[PDB]
Structure formats: C-alpha cells, structure tokens
Design a protein around this ligand. Structure first.
Ligand SMILES: CC(C)CCCC[C@](C)(O)[C@H]1CC[C@H]2[C@@H]3CC=C4C[C@@H](O)CC[C@]4(C)[C@H]3CC[C@@]21C
Length: 177
C-alpha cells in the first residue's frame, strides 16, 4: 500500500518494541495528542501456532463532517513467530472502525517491522494498506480512500516525530550513564 515510516533510530530494537507495543506512557501521550481516548489493551498472549496476539480497543474523536463525533475501534496485533528478542519484531496490526459510514466495508492493515541495526539502534518500517469486504461498489471506495490515506499519513508522521524526540532523550540518557 503505502510506506509511511522508514528510518533508523538510536533506540534498541528491544526498547522500540516496548515503546510501541506495550501500555507505555509514550503511547498514552501519543494517543492523546491524536485524540484517541479510552485505550484498553491486552497483554501479549501466546497461541498454539507460536505467534503472539494482542488486542486493543479505544475511541477516536473525529473531525469529519461525514462522521459522528466519536467512533469505537478495535485493533488486533499479531506478533509473528519469526520474531526474535531484541533483534527482529514483525507485527501485523488490523484496525476496525465501528461507527463511521461504511465501516462494515473496509479495515486497515498496518505492518510494523523493527530490526536491530547496531547495538542501541534499530530500523522501524511501517507500511499501511486498506482492505475491503462486502465489495463496496463504485463511489463507496473512492469516498473511503479520500477519508483515510490523509488521516493515516497524519497519524504516522506525528508518531515518527514523537519517536525522534524520544530517541533524542533516551539515547542521551543511555550515553550519559
Ligand atoms: C468513508 C468515510 C466516511 C470514512 C471516514 C472515517 C474513517 C477514518 C476516520 O478516516 C478512519 C479510516 C482509517 C482509520 C485509521 C486506520 C488505522 C489507524 C491506526 C491505529 O493505530 C489508530 C487508529 C487509526 C489512525 C485509524 C483512525 C480512523 C481512520 C483514520
């Protein structure tokens, strides 16, 4: 679909994963700045396949005249079995909206890839794709496209800006010790 973040940070692959995929204060501050409230999540849970599973719910406060003031959302995060601690993290995040128009007809798939670059460095790669169900006809999908890609771009750029500010204070704190 679209590649929104491709960057090497001066944060370890371990710390980057715990920043993004645990109930970190970093994520709480970032979600608030994006008007995402009432974040509820699970711990990472193992299943028979070997992959790990984490699910979240939250409410997105919307600025769209075509939508209501709020929409419920559900996120299912899949950490693939191929991941190795502090070395390689590959998460597939599927996001469902529940109160926007045509919410039954599409969802979003975000793939997060964290690979350790050096000793305290990592490369984060986030790609985004829209998925469709029930075969939305004609005008429905073009409306979905024009009301998603720009909001997803705005979302992940603010995350990259916050990760860079995090990199600047965390790498300094580690280096100074
Ligand atoms: C047809 C037309 C009336 C639809 C308009 C309303 C749709 C929204 C509001 O335009 C949706 C579409 C994609 C939705 C985003 C998809 C993925 C994520 C990543 C996750 O971490 C945090 C929530 C977030 C940013 C979702 C936010 C809500 C988005 C942006």
């Amino acid at each position: 679909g679209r590649l929104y973040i491709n960057r090497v940070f001066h944060i370890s692959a371990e710390r980057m994963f715990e920043l993004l995929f645990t109930s970190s204060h970093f994520m709480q501050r970032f979600a608030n700045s994006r008007n995402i409230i009432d974040v509820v999540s699970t711990p990472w849970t193992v299943e028979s396949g070997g992959n790990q599973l984490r699910t979240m719910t939250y409410t997105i406060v919307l600025s769209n005249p075509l939508t209501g003031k709020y929409t419920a959302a559900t996120e299912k995060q899949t950490l693939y079995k191929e991941s190795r601690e502090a070395q390689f993290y590959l998460v597939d995040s599927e996001v469902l909206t529940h109160d926007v128009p045509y919410h039954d007809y599409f969802y979003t798939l975000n793939r997060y890839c964290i690979v350790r670059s050096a000793k305290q460095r990592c490369r984060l790669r986030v790609s985004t794709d829209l998925k469709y169900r029930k075969q939305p006809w004609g005008l429905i999908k073009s409306l979905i496209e024009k009301n998603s890609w720009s909001s997803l771009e705005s979302y992940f750029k603010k995350l990259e800006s916050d990760l860079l500010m995090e990199e600047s204070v965390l790498s300094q704190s580690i280096e100074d010790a």
